[PDB]
Design a protein around this ligand. Structure first.
Ligand SMILES: N[C@@H](CCCC[NH3+])C(=O)O
Ligand code: NA
Length: 218
């Protein structure tokens, strides 16, 4: 049994539905990958801040949680190939003239937080994605910098209270599954399953289903 670790707070990638079950793109993907690898799985929810150390300590066996493949994270864990192509990061604000060099909210331990910390903007970090949106809505922050695919439905749901500002920024290597560095054989099973979904078009279909007809595909 493979314990699949996810954040459960990052729609539409992953979330806990009203039944208390893991749901989202990654629920469907993860289940189909395990089916194709011949593995049975069990889903484990873990907060983003500790999702890497808790994989390393053996609380679960994979991270499938919208995590970009990066060299920095490759220092402690190993990634499969990407299962979504690299997509942009974007700024979101309550007005068009928001000061993007002011206070910018980003989720802790993300490439977006890293980009803002290196920038001239003042970074404020929040534990969860929803807290970054709340910080903008309530005026504690000038804007939020986050994954564009996370922000698109949020902007559409806002009834005009939230909007994209500035330009998109490409960050990170595409989303991939994380595993312990001593787990090469399991990682290889997942890699072989991902490749099979790329080859037969089922991954592209899953991506468009969850991210829209215009989503980047393979
Ligand atoms: N893909 C970005 C954002 C992840 C956001 C998780 N709620 C990263 O890996 O840092
Ligand atoms: Na590594």
């Amino acid at each position: 049994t493979v314990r699949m670790g996810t954040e459960g707070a990052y729609p539409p990638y992953n979330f806990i539905n009203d039944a208390g079950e893991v749901d989202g793109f990654e629920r469907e993907l993860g289940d189909e990958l395990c089916k194709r690898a011949g593995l049975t799985c069990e889903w484990v929810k873990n907060d983003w801040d500790s999702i890497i150390p808790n994989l390393v300590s053996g609380n679960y066996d994979t991270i499938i949680a919208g995590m970009s493949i990066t060299d920095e994270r490759d220092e402690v864990i190993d990634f499969t190939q990407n299962y979504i192509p690299p997509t942009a990061s974007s700024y979101v604000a309550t007005s068009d003239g928001a000061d993007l060099s002011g206070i910018v909210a980003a989720q802790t331990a993300t490439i977006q937080a890293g980009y803002i910390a290196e920038s001239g903007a003042t970074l404020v970090e929040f534990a969860t994605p929803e807290e970054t949106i709340a910080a903008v809505r309530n005026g504690e922050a000038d804007a939020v910098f986050a994954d564009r695919d996370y922000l698109v439905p949020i902007v559409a749901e806002s009834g005009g209270e939230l909007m994209f500002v500035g330009d998109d920024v490409p960050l990170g290597g595409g989303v991939g599954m994380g595993l312990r560095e001593s787990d090469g054989e399991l990682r290889g099973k997942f890699d072989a399953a991902i490749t099979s979904m790329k080859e037969d078009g089922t991954l592209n279909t899953m991506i468009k289903k969850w991210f829209g007809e215009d989503a980047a595909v393979y």
